[PDB]
Structure 1
Amino acid sequence: MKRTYQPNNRKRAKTHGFRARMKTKSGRNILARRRAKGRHQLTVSDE
């Protein structure tokens, strides 16, 4: 049957993207929080 994850480049970028995350204080707060954890993958646009 049709499963949850149904890949869509533009979806992913527009939703979990760097521009997206920067558009809001809470997403900015993710960015900083992640940087802090030392993630290789700051954000989806890093893939």
Structure 2
Amino acid sequence: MKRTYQPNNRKRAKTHGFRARMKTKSGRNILARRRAKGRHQLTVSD
């Protein structure tokens, strides 16, 4: 029933990810956003 969640390492890591996030304005942005804003870790960390 092809849900949507099938995790494709290659991909998930790929399409998102530290690096990626830095890569752009937005990315970095909300990146610090959280950083400070609440702790946590981050995408790829996951």
TM-score by length of 1: 0.74
Unaligned runs of 5+ in 1: none
Is the Cα contact below 8 Å between 1:22 and 1:28 reproduced in 2? yes
Instruction: Quote the offset at 1:44 in angstroms.
Output: 2.5
Runs of 4+ in 1 over 6 A off after TM superposition: none
Q: How many residues align?
A: 46
The 3 A distance-change label for structure 1 pair 15 and 32 is same
Q: RMSD across aligned C-alpha pairs, in angstroms? A: 1.5
